[PDB]
Each structure stands twice: as C-alpha cells, then as structure tokens.
Design a protein around this ligand. Structure first.
Ligand code: GN1
Ligand code: A1IIR
Ligand code: A1IHU
Ligand code: A1IHU
Ligand code: A1IHU
Ligand code: CL
Length: 471
C-alpha cells in the first residue's frame, strides 16, 4: 500500500465522519497497517453511514395466509401425501435436489466453544447434529436408489461464518465427511457487516481492526453467488433446494414429501411451520402482510398481535404458524438473486460489542450495549414472491422441530429436550413397526431409518430403553 493510496482511503473515511478508524496508525507495525487498510478498503463508509442512519434514525393489513397458499400433512388427502413422497424421491433419484445448511451461528444463548452443529446432545451414539444430518442425507440417497437402481446424489452446501468456518471444516474432515463423498460437500461462508456505535461510528476491535459481525442468515443469497455455490448447482443440474437451520435435531433433510409437494405445486418458494406452542415462543410467525406472504420475527412482533385470539376459539392464537426454518426454493428463484439481494432490509439488534475506547485506546468490554448488529433474514424474500408461487405446509412438531437454542439446564429448546425428542421419536417408530420397548426412548440411527421405515426386523423383539439401533 503506497502513501497516495493510504491517504486517499483516509480521506474517504474522514469525509464520511469515520476518520477515527485511523486514529492509532501513529503506533502500528507495517503489517498491522495493511490489515487496517485492506479491511477498510472492503467497506464503503458512505453506505455504512446510510445503514447506520436507517438503523438508528429509522422511518399493516395483517391476516393468516389464505387457504390457497396453505396445506397440512395433518389433514392432507393420503393420496396427495403418497404422490408427494414419490415425486420427492424421484427428484432426489434424478440428482436434482440440493441442500443448503445454515450453520453461520455463533450460538450465543448456548455458549459453546465450538460450532453448534458439532454439539453432542448426549445421545448414546454421541453423534453431533452435523453427523445426524449427514446420515439422513446418506439414508435418503439410498432410499432414492431403491426406485432408480442408480446412484443418487444430494450435494450438501454448508454455510458458515468467519467464526465457525475453520472449526466446521476441521470437524467434517476429522469425521471423513460422515461417510459422504467430500466432493459432494461444499463448505462456504456468509458475509459480514461492521458493528456500529449508538452514535453511528464504526466500532474498532483493535487499533488495527474494525469490529465486524456475520450479515445474518439472509446473507445466504449473496454468499451463494460469491462462493461459487450457485454455479456448482447449475453445473450439477439442480432444480430444487432445501434450506434449513443446523440447530434442529429432528430436521428432515431433503424431506421428500416437502420437495414433491413444492415441485408439484410449481412454487418458487415453500416453507414449513408448526403450531406455535404459546404466545411467548421465540419463533417467527408466517402470515399475510399487505397482501403478501411474510414473516414477523419474535423480536419485532407487538404483544397485541402475538396475543390476538381466534374469534371462534378464544383460547387459540390468531397467528400460530411458527417458522421452523425449513424452506424450499426452485433453482430458477436463485437465478434472480442479483436483481433483489440488495433489497433485503437490515434488522437491528442492540449489542455489547468489545472495542477500543475512542481516544484512550483501551480495549474494553462495555457495560450497557454500546452499539448494534445488522442482519438480513432469509425469509424476507417471501413478500417478493406472489401468493400463487408460495406454499406453506404445516407439520408435526414432535417429528420435525426440536431446536437447540439454550444450554443444558434451561429446561427448553436445550440439549436434554433435543435428546428426549429424538429418543421419544425412535421409540414411537419401533412401536409402530411392531417392537416393544421395556423401560427412556430409543435412538434409531438415520442409516437404519430416515423416517420410521425399515424397522420390520424389530417386530416382536423387546428393546430395553435407553437403546441405540445402528448398523
Ligand atoms: C431469521 C430467522 O431465521 N429466524 C428464525 C430463527 O430464530 P433465531 O433468531 O435463530 O432464534 O429460528 C426460529 C426457530 O427456532 C424461527 O422461528 C425464526 O423465525
Ligand atoms: O433481532 C435479531 C437481530 C437483528 C439483527 C441482528 O440480530 N435477531 C432476533 C432473532 N432473529 C435473528 C437475530
Ligand atoms: C388454520 N391454521 N392457522 C395456523 C395454523 Br398452523 C393453522 N393450521
Ligand atoms: C424471475 N424472477 N424475477 C424476479 C423474481 Br422475485 C423472480 N423470482
Ligand atoms: C393459516 N395458516 N398459515 C400457515 C398455514 Br399451514 C396455515 N394453515
Ligand atoms: Cl419469487
């Protein structure tokens, strides 16, 4: 970096009212100086000022989704369920189905040292969430072959952040990709935005480093372009994508019912919900806003809409379609990302951000929250999508949604509720297949059963819970 170049960038920053990021250049090594220059060269402080301004100095008709845009597996015609299952498996067997795992979370409520997908919830197998998910992919590729007599590939695109990327890659490598082919698993990274003081100023982590944070799960779309992942999908002939969150231990990865349902309705986007468990559950609610499909995040909803009651049913929530972060896209939808990625709004959250005191140089952790994180949300493409190209499908919580949000000891959405849900699931499947569990719960490996099939061999047999059915 020359003097002219360093000076021209300084000017940009100074003119933008962000000159303080250069206030310790005085006392910097030649390479700490380049760390600062290179990182500042990758932000436009004017767009930073623009974001900071909408966030800090900021400027609906609201009904349930109409029944044309909604379905449920709890009351679908069984002929439909069967047809959707079959079509989903055929699309898997045609190598047209990809999976995008959103694993860009630091997992702050869980306070673990490792990525959340590495977490062992205490199952007898001691498998991670990542491994459980990989094995569902493996098992579904096998089920697909049973009706093609040919290999079935579901590529697995794993989206991480700066914080999770390296440990995620090491973990996958140390487990030999959980038995999948390395060449059908791509680990990529979401982008970042700088953290912002309450007063609009870029926070500095050190005297040579801007404080940045992941740009939210809504960062998926831009990261699909710049990572090369969308191009890999085009190359492989992918036409259908299942996107989910890593923290859900029950997630039906590439669920064939979901895929076949969406593909046969020819939507651009579909999404899963469950019945909200109470007014206060920390879930987005899917609904119709200003004529369009939309989500209100739990952090942005008002008490009155969260607590509104169904007129005919005075104890049931009016808005109870809980977002479980299981989305479908057509590949064609991803072909349009350049035209609307930029229109995704920035959600704001107050944060305690450790930084350099501006003036002192003192690398302090703050008492009250001293700034803000900006995040895009994955579901903010929903109102971009016509009702007729959108579908929402209700599923059963007990089979499809068990999130790991909190640490052992919390009492909900934690490792013990997760463990209990998998093992309770496994016992239900066995009991349906004819087995007898003595006693709690049973862990069924995904390689044995994806979704409750293949357990005939257990008919008549007694199983002493807790148990583990594997190879
Ligand atoms: C932007 C986004 O994906 N938000 C999701 C996500 O919330 P968290 O901020 O990750 O707790 O998971 C919830 C399900 O556990 C879902 O209800 C919500 O809408
Ligand atoms: O409110 C926020 C938020 C907005 C911006 C950064 O974090 N969240 C609440 C739940 N969804 C994701 C994070
Ligand atoms: C009729 N309705 N509203 C939310 C949800 Br779930 C359902 N099934
Ligand atoms: C093809 N296309 N263009 C804009 C949007 Br939204 C979509 N889905
Ligand atoms: C009223 N509503 N919203 C999502 C879903 Br399934 C339903 N039924
Ligand atoms: Cl669309």
């Amino acid at each position: 970096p020359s003097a002219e170049e360093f000076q021209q960038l300084r000017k940009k920053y100074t003119d933008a009212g962000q000159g303080h990021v250069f206030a310790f250049v005085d006392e910097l090594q030649t390479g700490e100086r380049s760390q600062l220059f290179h990182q500042l060269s990758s932000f436009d402080p004017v767009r930073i000022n623009e974001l900071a301004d909408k966030a800090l100095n900021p400027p609906a008709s609201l009904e349930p989704l109409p029944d044309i845009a909604t379905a449920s597996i709890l009351d679908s015609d069984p002929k439909d369920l069967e047809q959707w299952y079959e079509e989903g498996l055929k699309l898997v067997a045609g190598n047209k189905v990809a999976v995008v795992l959103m694993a860009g979370g630091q997992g702050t409520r869980l306070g673990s040292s490792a990525p959340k997908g590495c977490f062992d919830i205490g199952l007898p197998s001691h498998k991670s969430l990542f491994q459980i998910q990989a094995e569902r992919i493996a098992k579904l590729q096998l089920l697909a072959q049973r009706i093609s007599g040919k290999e079935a590939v579901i590529p697995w695109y794993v989206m991480t952040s700066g914080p999770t990327r390296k440990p995620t890659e090491e973990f996958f490598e140390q487990h030999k990709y959980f038995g999948l082919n390395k060449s059908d698993v791509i680990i990529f990274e979401q982008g970042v935005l700088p953290c912002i003081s309450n007063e609009g100023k870029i926070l500095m982590e050190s005297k040579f480093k801007v404080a940045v944070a992941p740009d939210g799960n809504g960062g998926i779309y831009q990261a699909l372009l710049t990572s090369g992942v969308r191009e890999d999908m085009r190359k492989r002939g992918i036409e259908h994508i299942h996107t989910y969150c890593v923290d859900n231990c029950l997630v039906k990865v590439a669920d064939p019912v979901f895929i076949g349902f969406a593909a046969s309705k020819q939507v651009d986007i579909a999404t899963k919900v469950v019945r909200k468990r109470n007014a206060t559950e920390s879930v987005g609610l899917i609904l119709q806003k200003n004529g369009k499909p939309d989500v209100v995040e739990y952090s942005e909803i008002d008490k009155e809409t969260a607590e509104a009651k169904d007129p005919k049913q005075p104890d049931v929530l009016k808005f109870r379609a809980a977002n479980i972060v299981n989305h479908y896209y057509s590949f064609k939808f991803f072909e349009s990302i350049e035209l609307w990625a930029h229109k995704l709004p920035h959600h704001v959250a107050r944060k305690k951000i450790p930084c350099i005191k501006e003036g002192t140089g003192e690398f302090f952790k703050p008492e009250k929250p001293n700034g803000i994180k900006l995040e895009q949300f994955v579901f903010d493409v929903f109102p971009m999508t016509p009702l007729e190209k959108f579908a929402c499908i209700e599923v059963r919580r007990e089979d499809e949604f068990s999130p790991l949000k909190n640490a052992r000891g919390t009492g909900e959405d934690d490792p013990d509720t997760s463990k209990r849900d998998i093992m309770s699931q496994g016992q239900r499947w066995i009991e349906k297949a004819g087995g007898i569990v003595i006693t709690v719960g049973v862990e069924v490996s995904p390689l044995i059963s994806y979704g409750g099939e293949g357990l005939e061999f257990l008919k008549g047999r007694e199983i002493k819970a807790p148990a583990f059915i594997e190879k």
